Design an enzyme around this catalytic site. Structure first.
Site, PDB file in Angstrom:
ATOM      1  N   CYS C  84      36.468  40.168  45.205  1.00  8.50           N
ATOM      2  CA  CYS C  84      36.585  40.936  44.129  1.00  8.50           C
ATOM      3  C   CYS C  84      35.876  42.160  44.187  1.00  8.50           C
ATOM      4  CB  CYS C  84      36.334  40.269  42.772  1.00  8.50           C
ATOM      5  SG  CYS C  84      37.320  39.865  41.550  1.00  8.50           S
ATOM      6  N   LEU C  85      36.559  43.407  44.589  1.00  6.44           N
ATOM      7  CA  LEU C  85      35.722  44.628  44.829  1.00  6.44           C
ATOM      8  C   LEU C  85      36.866  45.583  44.360  1.00  6.44           C
ATOM      9  CD1 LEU C  85      33.132  44.883  46.305  1.00  6.44           C
ATOM     10  CD2 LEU C  85      34.256  45.829  48.360  1.00  6.44           C
TER      11      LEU C  85
END
Ligand SMILES: Nc1ncnc2c1ncn2[C@@H]1O[C@H](COP(=O)(O)OP(=O)(O)OP(=O)(O)O)[C@@H](O)[C@H]1O
Ligand SMILES: [Mg+2]
Ligand SMILES: [Mg+2]
Lengths: 985, 76, 147
Positions: C84-85
């Site tokens: 989750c970037l």
């Protein structure tokens, strides 16, 4: 009652109400030449109530220059009578008729009246009646490389939608006491000054939730103002706003009033002094025709040009026009008066058909009122255009020979074109090529490739296909149809059912490409566009690109050694949502639709594939264990799709669907709320479920609810399809089975060595051996949006709406769900016609071999707002290499198939550059930092052998060249770019 | 100097610039007001597409000039 | 594409990062295998994590696909290795190199963000019972990221 199986792509442009109102409108069309027939075709495809034609003039040979419903067997017959029969086939819901006599009062039967090839006196007579009876009037004209359009919809036209854009909506963070609305973090409202908005779900200011629109004062990209809200409250938190679009009143002037003081629409801002010239020129043409028994000036005639210029001066004096007449331009209008080009006809017909749709539907902003256009830069300069060459020869190309001449006709007849794609633009392009006489000579040829098949929805804008053709190959049908239009193309069109890509280089190889004259792209995706662009750059062929989207379109030209390629520029990418938002915290219906699509794929596609692969491969277990990221879930899928949860009837499918409902709409929400309670706070003290995060609530199954029943039906039917069982539809069985269901207890869990291997082995041994199951297979569900009897869109809609109910989101209907999940691109026939016309206007420039970049034009347009714009192509960048001028795009190195060491020595000696990196395809053949032993191994090998070794695959027999990319440094150590290398095998 | 930029979707944008500003400054202003990266902007004035590295005076852009911000479309 | 990838590879070669090591697998320039050392001041200290990087055919105009291959007990990394970037989904601009992506991943490893989690249960454990989260992370790193 609109047939959505036919108007699917058009309803996403217009809408249900617009088409409903359009299906009650009558259109009369006067004139049945190329422009008239183009307009009638577009109107019939659009779906108006009916079309009536009026053209008692007998057919002539030259009329075939742009009329594609006329044949040489129809000479001497009225054009409308021979055109109605062919127009009646385009659409079965639109009757087409012919009237042999027109009276003024008869005009009261029609919603719109289109006039072509009619003198100005008759136009004034018709408009004097239509204007005072509130009938939309459109008049179009096409003279050689010049065109004109005039619209008059009445003094009180009401336009409901002005720009054709979706209403803007957004999520607010805070509303101050002075109406200063602020968006969420890094979110733009996109509004303009004067727009109207309405708020909902606002806390602290209930008054704003009534729904009354308010003015907007855009104070910045992130904040705006609505006024003073002192009374309604002190401050508002959170909530949403939606734009409100108000009707507009447009007042048109009659043609008689409009001639004196016209209101111009400018297609090109580079030439803003011309439309005043064309206004006088077209009136002078009408006067000249009225003074010569309805005859236009003869092609390239000096006497007629002088008389026409006298008429122009007389008209300019009479109308008190304070304009200086440009003699060259006006006499050019005189010379090309008898010209009749299919490209101009297509362009103007698309525009005029869109105007007719605007008149009937009261949507989009119409032209107000005069639109004068020219493409005079297309006139050839490498041939002799004179009175002797432009005289008619009594053939079907007279309308074109009257503009270009016989020598340019010979040039056109010798083209060897390649068309990629056979969609809407492909069909239009083939029509234009057939009409222009392209590739009808001894050395001409046309090649068309497309691997798709005809469908019902394709018939709404691809006019070369018919319902009897559904299921066939697009390229073959288009080839046959265009051979019917122009019999001279019999035996000069080759159709392939191959996809243009890296896998089809054995068919479209060096031999195929070296014989072409130009390539025309008619695709619908960027990957194929880039591939074809690279191929054309390597082979140095002109490329014609064109694209459409709803009412917008663009056309671009790529010329070898002159302009840049298609891939030298960037376009905005498609938007994707973060995985965290889709997985747990949605706030838009698009997120729920994406989640539903993933759920469909994971329920009915992936487990089936795993089971099938397990039964096929004798040793799938080892590969799954040592390769899959989650082998245990694969084992669970196999186990519960083979033995445990294998259905034996449809009642078991219904029970499975009920269990899945509980799993995905009741239990996961409970677990999520167990992890993040509605009263929880973040690490900074702010509430967790604030802003883009909406607190969900579990759903309790209620059979009386419609969405629950829809989901149960769709899931049960899809499971039965997977297992190949008979699926019921009567609600009685569903109610009987679901009544006697006892849910298992569920309690959220708080969490808290060799066991996992033990569990995996226990599952493995529980699976029946593949030998016991021979011939038993499960059918995976392949997503198909266009079929309405497979329960795909039904399941996606039901799941999306249920998840929206979980998070309190407004559900979407099946129409929007199909648009979003299916990734449908809105399409129109008018935009296709316009882009085909522009591309064919650039094609003649390409044929003439113009060497200057100011003569080519890239075009952009939006028909919803009536915007047209053109711009010269960007010249290819240059650079300096070894003190020589090198084109950055169109230059290459031609080297033999020499050794790698020999290549390095050649670059060191000739160019004085040190090779640092050399790659072919996606492989790194040589790098300067590799270990010395590897280089010594790879140095004494030839380029072909090196590529074969690195890629571990032999070169194809048909490979005749290798494209290598090289990065090298100069003597001082500064990186210098060089063109690619073309190794000759 | 004040100029207007009209989008292919009908939106209008007002920019405050000077004759000596480069095309890069104009593209940066358009990015600030719209979020469109400069590499994806296509500006047309009087039939010429503006190129990075040149000034407004090179294109004879004066006050109350109109530019068009266009884009390519993938359908067809 | 190829020139940009080669430029990045050469730049990585010039200065050893000392905390990451990315390079093409076999000879495929568009497929890279990267290694990340667990931050010293983190539960993942003394651990080696392997990542798979798949450059698109449109690089640098589309983000590369970066996936964890080693199992990691992190709130923002799920069992499939998805990260989750922001810089890899929509904030991707063709102006930052792979070294920046690796530094971002290392920073993410040094301090998780449970306010916007990808694995809600791990974020709940992190917020409520921190010591249990530390023990679980250390055990997972010991039994997956070492050996
Ligand atoms: N790589 C390719 N090679 C050849 N033809 C292609 C390629 N990619 C797309 N096409 C064809 O280009 C045409 C695109 O036109 P269009 O998108 O209007 O048609 P469609 O995709 O069949 O319809 P719709 O998009 O309305 O479902 C289609 O015939 C498609 O098959
Ligand atoms: Mg299709
Ligand atoms: Mg398509």
């Amino acid at each position: 009652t609109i047939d959505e199986g036919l108007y699917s792509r058009q309803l996403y442009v217009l809408g249900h109400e617009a088409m409903k109102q359009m299906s009650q409108s009558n259109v009369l069309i006067i004139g049945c030449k190329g422009l008239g027939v183009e307009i009638a075709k577009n109107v019939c495809l659009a779906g108006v109530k009916s079309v009536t034609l009026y053209d008692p003039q007998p057919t002539r040979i030259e009329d075939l220059s742009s009329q594609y419903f006329l044949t040489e067997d129809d000479i001497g017959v009225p054009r409308a009578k021979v055109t109605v029969s062919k127009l009646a086939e385009l659409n079965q819901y639109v009757p087409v008729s012919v009237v042999d006599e027109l009276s003024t009062e008869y005009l009261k039967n029609f919603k719109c009246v289109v006039v072509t090839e009619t003198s100005l006196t008759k136009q004034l007579e018709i408009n004097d009646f239509t204007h005072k009876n509130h009938i939309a009037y459109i008049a179009a004209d096409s003279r050689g490389l010049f065109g004109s359009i005039f619209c008059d919809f009445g003094e009180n036209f009401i336009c409901t939608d002005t720009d054709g854009n979706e209403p803007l909506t957004g999520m607010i963070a805070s509303i101050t006491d002075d109406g200063v609305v602020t968006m969420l973090e890094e979110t733009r409202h996109g509004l303009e000054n004067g727009d109207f908005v309405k708020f909902t779900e606002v806390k602290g200011m209930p008054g704003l939730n009534d729904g009354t629109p308010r003015k907007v004062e855009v104070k910045g990209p992130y904040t705006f103002s609505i006024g003073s809200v002192k009374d309604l409250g002190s401050a508002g938190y959170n909530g949403v706003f939606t734009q409100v679009k108000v009707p507009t009143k447009i007042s048109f002037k009659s043609l008689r009033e409009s001639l004196k003081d016209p209101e111009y629409v400018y297609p090109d801002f580079g030439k803003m002094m011309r439309p005043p010239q064309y206004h006088i020129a077209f009136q002078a043409l009408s006067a000249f025709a009225d003074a010569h028994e309805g005859s236009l000036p003869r092609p390239r005639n000096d006497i007629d040009a002088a008389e026409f210029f006298e008429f122009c001066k007389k008209i300019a004096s009479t109308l008190q026009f304070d304009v200086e007449l440009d003699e060259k331009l006006i006499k050019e209008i005189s010379y090309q008066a008898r010209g009749d080009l299919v490209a101009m006809s297509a362009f103007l017909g698309g525009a005029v058909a869109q105007e007719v749709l605007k008149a009937t539907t009261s949507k989009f902003y119409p032209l107000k009122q005069y639109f004068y256009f020219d493409s005079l830069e297309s006139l050839p300069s490498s041939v002799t255009i004179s009175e002797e060459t432009c005289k008619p020869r009594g053939c079907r190309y007279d309308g074109q020979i009257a503009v270009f001449g016989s020598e340019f006709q010979e040039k056109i007849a010798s083209l060897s074109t390649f068309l990629v794609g056979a969609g809407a633009i492909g069909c239009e392009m083939l029509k234009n090529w057939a009409m222009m006489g392209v590739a009808t000579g001894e050395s001409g040829h046309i090649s068309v490739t497309d691997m798709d098949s005809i469908e019902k929805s394709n018939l709404n804008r691809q006019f070369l296909f018919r319902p009897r053709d559904v299921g066939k190959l697009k390229s073959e049908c288009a080839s046959t149809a265009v051979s019917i239009m122009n019999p001279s193309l019999t035996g000069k069109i080759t159709s392939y059912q191959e996809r243009v890509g890296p896998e089809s280089e054995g068919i479209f190889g060096d031999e195929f490409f070296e014989k072409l004259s130009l390539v025309t792209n008619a695709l619908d995706n960027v990957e194929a566009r880039m591939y074809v662009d690279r191929r054309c750059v390597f082979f140095e062929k002109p490329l014609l690109e064109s694209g459409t989207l709803g009412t917008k379109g663009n056309t671009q030209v790529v010329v070898p050694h002159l302009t840049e390629s298609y891939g030298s520029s960037q376009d905005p990418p498609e938007k994707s949502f973060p995985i965290c938002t889709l997985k747990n915290f949605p706030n838009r219906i698009e997120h729920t639709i994406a989640w539903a699509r993933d759920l469909f794929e994971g329920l009915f596609k992936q487990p089936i594939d795993n089971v099938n692969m397990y039964l096929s491969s004798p040793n799938f277990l080892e590969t799954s264990l040592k390769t899959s990221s989650n082998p245990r879930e694969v084992l669970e899928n196999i186990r519960d799709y083979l033995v445990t949860e294998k259905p034996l009837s449809f009642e078991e499918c219904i029970m499975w669907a009920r269990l899945q409902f509980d799993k995905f709409f009741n239990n996961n929400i409970q677990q999520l709320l167990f992890n993040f309670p509605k009263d929880s706070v973040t690490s900074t003290g702010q509430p967790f479920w604030s802003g883009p995060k909406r607190a969900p609530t579990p759903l309790s199954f209620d059979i009386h609810n419609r969405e629950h029943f829809d989901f149960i039906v769709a899931a049960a039917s899809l499971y039965a399809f997977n297992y190949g069982l008979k699926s019921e539809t009567d609600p009685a069985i569903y109610e009987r089975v679901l009544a006697g269901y006892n849910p298992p207890p569920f309690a959220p869990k708080s969490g808290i060595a060799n066991k996992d291997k033990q569990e995996l082995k226990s599952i493995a041994d529980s699976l029946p051996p593949p030998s016991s199951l021979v011939g038993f297979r499960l059918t995976p569900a392949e997503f198909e949006k266009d079929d309405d009897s497979n329960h795909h869109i039904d399941f996606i809609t039901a799941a999306s709406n249920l998840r929206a109910m979980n998070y309190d989101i407004t559900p979407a209907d099946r129409f929007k769900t199909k648009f979003v999940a299916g990734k449908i691109v809105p399409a129109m026939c008018t935009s296709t016609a316009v882009v085909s016309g522009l591309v064919c206007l650039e094609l003649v420039k390409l044929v003439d071999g113009k060497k200057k970049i100011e003569e080519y034009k890239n075009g952009f347009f939006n028909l919803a707002i009536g915007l047209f714009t053109f711009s010269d192509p960007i010249a290819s960048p240059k650079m300096k290499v070894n003190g020589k001028e090198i084109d950055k795009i169109w230059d290459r190195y031609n080297l033999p198939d020499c050794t790698l060491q020999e290549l390095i020595d050649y670059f060191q000696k000739e160019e004085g550059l040190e090779v640092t990196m050399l790659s072919s395809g996606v492989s790194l053949l040589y790098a300067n930092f590799q270990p010395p032993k590897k280089l010594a191994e790879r140095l004494p090998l030839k380029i072909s052998e090196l590529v074969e070794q690195i890629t571990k695959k032999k070169l194809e027999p048909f490979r005749k060249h290798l494209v290598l990319e090289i990065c090298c440094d100069d003597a001082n150590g500064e990186d210098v770019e060089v063109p690619f290398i073309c190794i000759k095998l | 100097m004040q100029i207007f930029v009209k989008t292919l979707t009908g939106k209008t944008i007002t920019l405050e610039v000077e004759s000596s500003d480069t095309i890069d400054n104009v593209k940066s202003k358009i990015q600030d007001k719209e979020g469109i990266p400069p590499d994806q902007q296509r500006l047309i004035f009087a039939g010429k597409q503006l190129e990075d590295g040149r000034t407004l005076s090179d294109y004879n852009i004066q006050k109350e000039s109109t530019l068009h911000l266009v884009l390519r479309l993938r359908g067809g | 594409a190829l020139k940009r990838i080669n430029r990045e590879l050469a730049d990585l070669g010039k200065d050893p990062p000392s905390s990451s090591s990315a390079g093409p697998v076999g000879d495929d320039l568009f497929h890279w295998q990267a290694t990340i050392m667990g931050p010293a001041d983190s539960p993942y200290a003394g651990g080696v994590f392997f990542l798979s990087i798949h450059f698109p055919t449109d690089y640098p105009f589309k983000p590369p696909k970066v996936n964890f291959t080693t199992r990691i007990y992190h709130p923002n990394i799920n069992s499939n290795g998805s990260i989750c970037l922001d810089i890899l989904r929509d904030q991707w601009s063709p102006a930052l190199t792979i070294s920046k992506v690796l530094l971002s991943i290392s920073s993410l490893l040094t301090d998780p963000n449970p306010d916007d989690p990808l694995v809600p249960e791990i974020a709940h454990v992190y917020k409520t019972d921190r010591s249990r989260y530390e023990l679980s992370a250390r055990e997972w790193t010991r039994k997956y990221a070492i050996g």
